[PDB]
Amino acid sequence: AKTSDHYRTQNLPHRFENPDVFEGYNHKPQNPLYYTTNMGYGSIPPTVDTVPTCFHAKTNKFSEHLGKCGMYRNEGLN
Amino acid sequence: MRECISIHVGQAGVQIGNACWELYCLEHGIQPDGQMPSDKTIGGGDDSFNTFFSETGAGKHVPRAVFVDLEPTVVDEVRTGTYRQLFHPEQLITGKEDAANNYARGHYTIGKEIVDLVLDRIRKLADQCTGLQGFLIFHSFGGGTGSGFASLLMERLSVDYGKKSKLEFAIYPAPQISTAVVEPYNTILTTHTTLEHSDCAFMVDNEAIYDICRRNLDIERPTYTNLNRLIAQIVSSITASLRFDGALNVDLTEFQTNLVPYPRIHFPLATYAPVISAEKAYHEQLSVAEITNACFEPANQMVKCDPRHGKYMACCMLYRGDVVPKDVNAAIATIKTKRTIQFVDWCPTGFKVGINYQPPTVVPGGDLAKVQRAVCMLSNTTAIAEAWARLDHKFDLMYAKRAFVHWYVGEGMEEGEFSEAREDLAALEKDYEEVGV
Amino acid sequence: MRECISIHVGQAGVQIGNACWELYCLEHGIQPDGQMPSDKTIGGGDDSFNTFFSETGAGKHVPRAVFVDLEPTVVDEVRTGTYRQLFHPEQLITGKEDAANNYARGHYTIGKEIVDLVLDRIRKLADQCTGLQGFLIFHSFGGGTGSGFASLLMERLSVDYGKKSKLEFAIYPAPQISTAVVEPYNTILTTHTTLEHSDCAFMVDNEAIYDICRRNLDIERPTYTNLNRLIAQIVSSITASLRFDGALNVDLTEFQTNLVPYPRIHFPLATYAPVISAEKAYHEQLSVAEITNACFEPANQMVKCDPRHGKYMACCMLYRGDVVPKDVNAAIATIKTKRTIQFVDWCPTGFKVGINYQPPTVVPGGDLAKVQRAVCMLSNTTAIAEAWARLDHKFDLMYAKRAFVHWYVGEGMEEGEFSEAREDLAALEKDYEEVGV
Amino acid sequence: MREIVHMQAGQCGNQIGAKFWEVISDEHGIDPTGTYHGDSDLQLERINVYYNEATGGKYVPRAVLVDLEPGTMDSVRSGPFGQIFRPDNFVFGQSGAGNNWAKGHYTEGAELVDSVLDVVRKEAESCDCLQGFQLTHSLGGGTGSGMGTLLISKIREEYPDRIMNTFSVVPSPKVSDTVVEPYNATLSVHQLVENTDETYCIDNEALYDICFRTLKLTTPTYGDLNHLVSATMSGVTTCLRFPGQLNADLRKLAVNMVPFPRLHFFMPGFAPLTSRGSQQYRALTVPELTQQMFDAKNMMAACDPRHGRYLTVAAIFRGRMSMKEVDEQMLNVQNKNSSYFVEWIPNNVKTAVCDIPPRGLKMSATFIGNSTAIQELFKRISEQFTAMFRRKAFLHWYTGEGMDEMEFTEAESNMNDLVSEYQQYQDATAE
Amino acid sequence: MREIVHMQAGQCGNQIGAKFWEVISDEHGIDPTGTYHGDSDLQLERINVYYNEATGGKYVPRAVLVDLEPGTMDSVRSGPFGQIFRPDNFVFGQSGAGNNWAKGHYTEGAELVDSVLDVVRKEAESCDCLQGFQLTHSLGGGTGSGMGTLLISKIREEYPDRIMNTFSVVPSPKVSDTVVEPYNATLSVHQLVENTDETYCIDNEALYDICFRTLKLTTPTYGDLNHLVSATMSGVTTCLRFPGQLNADLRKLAVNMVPFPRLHFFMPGFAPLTSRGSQQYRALTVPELTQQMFDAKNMMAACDPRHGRYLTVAAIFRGRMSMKEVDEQMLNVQNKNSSYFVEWIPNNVKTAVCDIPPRGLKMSATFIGNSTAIQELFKRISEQFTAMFRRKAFLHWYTGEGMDEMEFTEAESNMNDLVSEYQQYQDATAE
Numbered sequence A: 001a002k003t004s005d006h007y008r009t010q011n012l013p014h015r016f017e018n019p020d021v022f023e024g025y026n027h028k029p030q031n032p033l034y035y036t037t038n039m040g041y042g043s044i045p046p047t048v049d050t051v052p053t054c055f056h057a058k059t060n061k062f063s064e065h066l067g068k069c070g071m072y073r074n075e076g077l078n
Numbered sequence B, C: 001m002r003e004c005i006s007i008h009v010g011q012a013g014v015q016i017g018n019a020c021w022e023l024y025c026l027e028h029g030i031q032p033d034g035q036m037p038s039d040k041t042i043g044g045g046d047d048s049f050n051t052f053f054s055e056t057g058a059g060k061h062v063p064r065a066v067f068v069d070l071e072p073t074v075v076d077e078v079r080t081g082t083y084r085q086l087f088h089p090e091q092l093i094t095g096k097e098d099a100a101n102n103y104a105r106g107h108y109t110i111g112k113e114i115v116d117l118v119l120d121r122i123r124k125l126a127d128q129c130t131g132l133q134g135f136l137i138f139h140s141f142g143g144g145t146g147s148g149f150a151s152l153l154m155e156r157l158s159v160d161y162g163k164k165s166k167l168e169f170a171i172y173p174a175p176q177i178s179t180a181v182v183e184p185y186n187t188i189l190t191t192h193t194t195l196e197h198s199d200c201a202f203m204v205d206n207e208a209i210y211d212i213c214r215r216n217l218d219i220e221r222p223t224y225t226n227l228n229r230l231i232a233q234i235v236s237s238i239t240a241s242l243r244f245d246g247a248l249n250v251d252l253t254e255f256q257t258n259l260v261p262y263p264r265i266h267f268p269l270a271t272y273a274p275v276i277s278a279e280k281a282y283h284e285q286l287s288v289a290e291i292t293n294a295c296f297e298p299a300n301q302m303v304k305c306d307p308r309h310g311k312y313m314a315c316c317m318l319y320r321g322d323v324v325p326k327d328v329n330a331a332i333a334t335i336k337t338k339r340t341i342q343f344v345d346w347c348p349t350g351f352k353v354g355i356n357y358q359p360p361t362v363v364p365g366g367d368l369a370k371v372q373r374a375v376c377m378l379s380n381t382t383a384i385a386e387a388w389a390r391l392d393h394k395f396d397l398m399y400a401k402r403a404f405v406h407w408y409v410g411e412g413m414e415e416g417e418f419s420e421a422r423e424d425l426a427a428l429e430k431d432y433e434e435v436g437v
Numbered sequence D, E: 001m002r003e004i005v006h007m008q009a010g011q012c013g014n015q016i017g018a019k020f021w022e023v024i025s026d027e028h029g030i031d032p033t034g035t036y037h038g039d040s041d042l043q044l045e046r047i048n049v050y051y052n053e054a055t056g057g058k059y060v061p062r063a064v065l066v067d068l069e070p071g072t073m074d075s076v077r078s079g080p081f082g083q084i085f086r087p088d089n090f091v092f093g094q095s096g097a098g099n100n101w102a103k104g105h106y107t108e109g110a111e112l113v114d115s116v117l118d119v120v121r122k123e124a125e126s127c128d129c130l131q132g133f134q135l136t137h138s139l140g141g142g143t144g145s146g147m148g149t150l151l152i153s154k155i156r157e158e159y160p161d162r163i164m165n166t167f168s169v170v171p172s173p174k175v176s177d178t179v180v181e182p183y184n185a186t187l188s189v190h191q192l193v194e195n196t197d198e199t200y201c202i203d204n205e206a207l208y209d210i211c212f213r214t215l216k217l218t219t220p221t222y223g224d225l226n227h228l229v230s231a232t233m234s235g236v237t238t239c240l241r242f243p244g245q246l247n248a249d250l251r252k253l254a255v256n257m258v259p260f261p262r263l264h265f266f267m268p269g270f271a272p273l274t275s276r277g278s279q280q281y282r283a284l285t286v287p288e289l290t291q292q293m294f295d296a297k298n299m300m301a302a303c304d305p306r307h308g309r310y311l312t313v314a315a316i317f318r319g320r321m322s323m324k325e326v327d328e329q330m331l332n333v334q335n336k337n338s339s340y341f342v343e344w345i346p347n348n349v350k351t352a353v354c355d356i357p358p359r360g361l362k363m364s365a366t367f368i369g370n371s372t373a374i375q376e377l378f379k380r381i382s383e384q385f386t387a388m389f390r391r392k393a394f395l396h397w398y399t400g401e402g403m404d405e406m407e408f409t410e411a412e413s414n415m416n417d418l419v420s421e422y423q424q425y426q427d428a429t430a431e
């Protein structure tokens, strides 16, 4: 299923646009008792509904690339 | 480059870590294997994960967390749980004995032989860290691991690192509801150590969360799952300004230095609004004015401490969602014009607002409503001395006839230490009423 | 823009609010689930709902009225019947204990454990506004929740909101027909707190509406629903000028300053015309002059006192439907030329006429016919002095040997309170007769 | 959440409360095995008033039946709707009551009352509201009088602000059936006056008369009587249950009933009552219902209210009806029989209407008449007690278990001052 | 890894430890042979607390069984779940016990204890990290009060900082079964006080009362009594073996319960106890579970908790619950009766909750009380001892074997000093 024919999508990545690519969110236990409440944080997977509709994450490629090399220094002869 | 190492100490620390790393992974779209999903070949422009996870040489995500608990049950459950592939194996550090609600046992015994390994893992994380904005330590004042080992760990990070911030999320005991018995002793003894080695000392009380869940969420039977999800939402809304961009970004140093007037009032008070449920939240606008007016209420506090018996010294407000600065400023103006909120005389301009475009990411199966606006409000009210007055009352009426003290004096705790901690906290609350008046 | 927040206290209040909001939803075209059905996009404006119904971001019409009772029976019936998703969950506040026709019980021991929550909900509803116009309170003078808690609620409302209008709709005990024994006690204790400390108070009996339903509607064994519908029609005709449009509208704060002369005389009486069934409505010539002269008929009032034995001090006459403002003046002239209808000497002009364009709606399953023009004639006069004289007679007769007073003393209220309220109402009777002469 | 714990003292109380549970379980839709076999949603809405809830959707009564002889437990458990009760709520003793107030109060009832209070406290504050304590008993016998009054005293000491209803089967002179009935009644009304909030007294003579000449049954053996009593119980408690247009709970009745604190002895009546031969011939309109309600031959007390004066009158109607018919009838009965109403209380009648009728008929009503004619039973019991206390008759059977004559004399004095109190408002004036 | 070494002693100790092992092997899913036919991995996650690995996957309990006669060892080995134990730690003697404290502490038992300590050192250094030892003696025999206290003294002197948990069955006023029982109890409690971290004293009369009231059973025998004690054991040490929510091990209980070092005599209770027919009518949730903990009828010590003040109360709950509900219930019972609670320890109920219920019932709880009501039982034992000792009755055996009367004098002196220590923190106020 898509979160586009069902919701509003604003520049959301493909990772959240298809919530079916999420695996490992089940981990079904043994026989249904011995069901400690602490392992209830690995509950039901994110789906088309409980997914972010907006992803406003900054990108620091330019800043990181300039920060590794270093800022400008007055080096010359004039 | 902005990166925060989280240290989760105690059983409360490990459960907070579970319910907060679940929210972090589910917000950044990382499955519990630690594996980043299909990015359509080219990875693209996305580096919000860098504040909590690191790109290894495979495309995986190992979190910047150190889970420490002396008792090898709650952390072995995480090692056998659904998030077993997330954490590095030499990050869920455990011992073989317990500290058993004993500050002396957690500080001068078995908790001591593990602090070297914890510091070595912290050193490795800081070495692989480029820019360390601040450590983020989650524990409880119940006792044992959460007080003695947490105090020792804070002292050791203070003496080795220094400078860099150390935010603290401490679970605080209630006026009436309590689990352990030597909780006033363990909480008095740890204030002496969390005073001069903490930069912010956020306090959460369980009874306030119970009342909040029973009143606003229509759940008659709350538990630690809901408690730690609320605390996870608090810390996620605090730290979201790093990972997700916003107008008026407020990062860790900024709301550290715009929240504390003096280097003895560094014990803020969190509040989340809305904490409403979905069936109720169907019938409101959830406007900015509404979610600000339903945030200074004494019924929505997080500590069981009504701020009417005190003055607000500082107030940071982190808005998270589709909020507009015009409505933020109108809400601030209305809050200032209302008379019941008494701000202190030497701070006419105390409000630090921070906007983030990202709405709060709902966790499926949770009890909270799923809405496009939220506020995490960090007050610095002078009313916080009420809890410490009740703490002194309980400590005095236990220490009048030396109850429960033989365990401490056998495992450490020269008998003047209790009196020293009592004197320090009494002088501190004297300082708090001094800055209140 | 023009808000009319309602509070419905007591069982009579909750039932009359059920009928009132059924009428509001049917005349605003809102289905009981909150949405607006039948392809809402037709029409450009239709902002008439923003007096009684709010509007969330998703666009739901959420009403502005708090249904408060101490027993959960009628409130749970509302929560389980038809209008279920329309009201907010924190809008139907209920208690454990009942007030049990006991003003002292509902005012001093049970009323104070729910008053903070109802005032907080009124706080939230008033904050969800853009400038409030007037509170509409609905209760019965039979006693209990409708008298004592209503009095305490009005006291705290007058403390909180300064000079906002607080219009009462009181179910006053009829001369002969009544359903309790301590109703004179409750009315005497309630008039003290609603006289000097509340705004204009519309007051209706029950047997007058009983006789009207017997005669006009030609219906012989109906129940309280066919009284609550008529009072809902009256209150709709009162506060319809805020929502709808028409020539010479009458604002809610302009009702008071142009009806009640002195700030102790604020007890007018209502009369709705023409109440009629369909078979009788098909057989006459419903017109402005006819409904005007049928308003002043002493057999059509909703208060059992003859206005022929009193003085007409002022009259605000509100019209709905196909009414031109020339037949209104032609009817006022032919009323003022009649000698039997007697006006007080210091009042040459005694009429405030107002006109609203849109005709009164017809409820499905009702008994009123599809009327084209209607009047809610609201007159301040001196005829209710006889009714309060009769109630003074009943209260003095029962208080002669201290019947039923041991309860009120038992949950705590001094015996001098009854004498204080009795002498207050005696001074009120003196005030009415000296105004009349 | 308003809710009553129900407790039945004595063999009479146990049977008359077993019939009460048998009729209200049928009213609420509960089967004999304790599950909800009900059709309407409204039946399982106020079931917390009288029932708890166990695992598997099983509803148990909140009944804490107490006796001191083991045969009555067999008689209440072998009957229908008998297995529904919790077996922990069956505390009793193996001794013999002896029809002795001294035995049931001081010697053998005092040993059991600690465990009885334990179970009553558990079933009472394993709760949230706890409005009512309904004890049901007979005056004149043993544990119905002594054990019941001791239980009333201890419970009123424990909970001083909760409603105390007592359905008391006061003895009648024509029925007799026991020679120590005046002793037990006169010695138990002392505790019933100072403690209970509402006490409804029921005459077995009146029950036999209403079975003879109203129900017209040839042999009303032992169950028609307590069926009528159970119908009256359901009528007076229905307002905490299925919602109506104008309801009135136990406090709403009690506030509007008693003018003065020691006037809480009531004469009940449930009169949509017709024989099977006339049920096809009579209508069931509100005027017919209220005229046979105010008819004195449909009263569960042997006192004729014409020889007296109504202090207050209740009318709890059940059924969907018109409230300016019931109200004009309540006004019409006052305007007609104005001489039998006290002149210093205008509007002596309190009216409540619930819209859900009992199982059977579509309309019903319950009458509670606080009148100054109830002193006839009290005067006759006082006369029969003072005709026996002169020549010390049957007195060693109380002094051996241990009582002085001062207790008997103070009980007779408290009898006589209450009779004089009712006579005071029988013969009085408005001003 | 935490672990508990079990040391059983006496006929009572061997029987009750055999019952304990055959109920916790069923809890962990262990065959009588010793093979895991379980159904989950949480059973094998912490199986090393009680079992030692063998070749192939067989599990051998870490229990050392001690007696002075062959007797109960042969009975247990012939009985079911007798083939699971190590055959090399069935150490016994060929002599007799004589139900004599002097014979158990100074005669031939003083060289059997060398072999028992050799076996215990083998089972202790064949390990990684001892949480401690538990012992289950009888307090009134020659082996329970003899061999048992000698084992406690040797273990305390050799390992000084490990948790010692001795359960022990205290004598009773009625139901005695032994004539020198006060002598053995008084001589053994003196060694219990200075050498044991904590004791969970249990009374046979209270167990019989629990069976005759709650769990009807007609004939209660000893299997059901040992089942109750074993359920108490498995309830109190369940957080060591099963993970979940906020948990508490034995050292955490020790540091929370005992305020001052000679005050570690605890008053236990298991409370999902319901009758066979009452199970259907029972509801199972936290409030009624709480009141069944705080019911004096469901206590395994004969002392009345209303005859004293609770110092501290441990509540070890098991099952998926709402710990908001359990904390609210603990605060509610404290605020309900704050009279039976010390003022100088505010909110003195240590609470722990685990998420693994025992087999059968859905929701469990274990009550531990460090009450000041045990001083009346201790005063009673001292009264029996001094009444027997004023005439030097049954003392010639002890003196002829060789113990001076100074030892009995110090036993009675420590007896009365401990009674006074319990007495002062009952009327000691805050300020």
Ligand SMILES: Nc1nc2c(ncn2[C@@H]2O[C@H](COP(=O)(O)OP(=O)(O)OP(=O)(O)O)[C@@H](O)[C@H]2O)c(=O)[nH]1
Pocket: B009, B010, B011, B012, B013, B015, B016, B071, B098, B099, B100, B101, B102, B106, B139, B140, B141, B142, B143, B144, B145, B146, B171, B172, B173, B178, B179, B180, B206, B224, B227, B228, E246
């Ligand atoms: N909010 C919240 N509080 C918790 C949670 N778990 C434990 N606590 C608090 O922790 C207190 C108990 O002490 P702990 O912090 O658990 O002690 P510990 O971490 O187990 O360390 P030791 O006592 O040495 O075993 C209680 O009073 C609780 O308030 C949790 O999951 N959420």
Ligand SMILES: Nc1nc2c(ncn2[C@@H]2O[C@H](COP(=O)(O)OP(=O)(O)OP(=O)(O)O)[C@@H](O)[C@H]2O)c(=O)[nH]1
Pocket: C009, C010, C011, C012, C013, C015, C016, C069, C070, C098, C099, C100, C101, C102, C140, C141, C142, C143, C144, C145, C146, C147, C171, C178, C179, C180, C205, C206, C224, C225, C227, C228, D245, D246
């Ligand atoms: N006109 C009208 N009057 C009503 C209605 N319902 C109740 N009343 C009046 O209310 C009076 C009794 O008081 P209630 O309103 O029923 O009681 P309350 O205000 O809920 O407080 P309590 O007595 O504690 O229940 C009666 O005398 C009736 O005249 C109604 O639906 N319409």
Ligand SMILES: Nc1nc2c(ncn2[C@@H]2O[C@H](COP(=O)(O)OP(=O)(O)O)[C@@H](O)[C@H]2O)c(=O)[nH]1
Pocket: D009, D010, D011, D012, D013, D015, D016, D097, D099, D138, D140, D141, D142, D143, D144, D145, D169, D175, D176, D177, D178, D204, D207, D222, D225, D226
């Ligand atoms: N109406 C009615 N009266 C009863 C019933 N059972 C007994 N009585 C009357 O109560 C009196 C005996 O009371 P009893 O049951 O022995 O009281 P107890 O000794 O406490 O059990 C007799 O005179 C009967 O007339 C009953 O089921 N219904």
Ligand SMILES: Nc1nc2c(ncn2[C@@H]2O[C@H](COP(=O)(O)OP(=O)(O)O)[C@@H](O)[C@H]2O)c(=O)[nH]1
Pocket: E009, E010, E011, E012, E013, E015, E016, E097, E099, E138, E140, E141, E142, E143, E144, E145, E169, E176, E177, E178, E204, E222, E223, E225, E226
């Ligand atoms: N709970 C329980 N108690 C027992 C059992 N057998 C004996 N007892 C109690 O133990 C006491 C006798 O102690 P005993 O075992 O003979 O001591 P020993 O002679 O040294 O072995 C008696 O008072 C019994 O009440 C049993 O199977 N279960």
Ligand SMILES: [Mg+2]
Pocket: B010, B011, B071, B145
């Ligand atoms: Mg721990």
Ligand SMILES: [Mg+2]
Pocket: C010, C011, C071, D247
């Ligand atoms: Mg009502």
